[PDB]
Copies of this chain bind each other. A is one copy, B any other.
Amino acid sequence: IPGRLDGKVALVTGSGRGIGAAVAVHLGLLGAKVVVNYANSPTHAQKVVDEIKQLGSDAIAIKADVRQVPEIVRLFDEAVAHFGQLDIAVSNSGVVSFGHLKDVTEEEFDRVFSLNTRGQFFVAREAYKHLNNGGRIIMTSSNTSRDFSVPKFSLYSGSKGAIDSFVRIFSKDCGDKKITVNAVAPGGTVTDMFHDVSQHYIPGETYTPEERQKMAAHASPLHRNGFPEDIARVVGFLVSAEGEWINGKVLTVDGGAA
């Protein structure tokens, strides 16, 4: 069936919440067995797992802090040990930071890069090691990587610039087990990371999340916000057999937003 992952096994970093959980649920709905990674949210992780079973697929929830390379090896090893194999691996887990360059401390740089940049690099490494031939790797970026220059968004933005460079090359290295590497580069997607940002990137903590959401709904010429489900559908296609001939590319899923 076009678009489906029946008999495929997937892993998603940070799939208890946000775009993570919509991806896991969508791969599940598409036919794949889902390994749902969290670090701080076992409760929402279990809801995602149960939601996937309710629709007919299988899922488990493994805790692992993807800032820790040993916990990533354990994450993938345990994935393989439980479902038998891994076809698909979506590096989703990341954090936002906001600040003028003059006020960025070492501690803020390392927090962001450990997860966004370094953590995803090793999620990709262990993905290649653990993946069936024909498999899929997805990494997660930002339209603030190349397309939008928000002031005081340097640290986060470069953390993702590094992801764009990695995928192009990764798709070369990974071709030797016929694994395709792409990133998705979401724009404003309604999650707690979006609401934490809109507050700092609008003249401005005095507006309800609802109203910053309505303001940003205008940036899109479709007159709406992006949603986890929007980015999930694009990851779904990429990780299908039909999305094969997209390789080494970065897809921006923002809606034509300005």
Which residues from chain A sit less than 8 Å from chain B, CB to CB? Answer: 1-4, 29-30, 69, 100-102, 104, 106, 109-110, 113, 117-118, 121-122, 124-125, 128-129, 144-146, 149-155, 157-166, 168-176, 178, 180-181, 220-223, 226, 230-231, 233-234, 236-237, 242-249, 251-256, 258
Contact = CB atoms under 8 A, between A and B. Distances in A.
Contact of A165 (B106, B110, B118, B160): B160
B101 A170 contact: yes
A196 B55 CA distance: 49
Given A102-B129, A170-B154, A234 B243 contact: yes
25 contacts: A1-B2, A3-B237, A69-B106, A117-B117, A117-B162, A121-B158, A149-B168, A149-B172, A149-B248, A149-B256, A151-B172, A152-B173, A154-B166, A157-B169, A158-B163, A159-B162, A172-B258, A178-B222, A221-B247, A233-B242, A234-B237, A234-B245, A236-B242, A237-B242, A245-B253
What 9 A-B pairs are tightest by C-beta distance, nearest first?
A175-B221, A161-B165, A230-B245, A247-B256, A248-B256, A154-B169, A171-B256, A233-B242, A2-B3
Contact of A102 (B128, B146, B160, B243): B128
Contact of A175 (B2, B153, B154, B222): B222
A129 to B, nearest CB: 6
Contacts of A234: 237, 242-243, 245-246
A165 B30 CA distance: 34
Contacts of A2: 1-4, 29-30, 233, 236
A113 B109 contact: no
A237 B161 CA distance: 26
A122 B4 CA distance: 36
A135 to B, nearest CB: 12
Contacts of A253: 245-246
Contacts of A146: 146, 164-165, 168
B171 A161 contact: no
Contacts of A106: 69, 118, 122
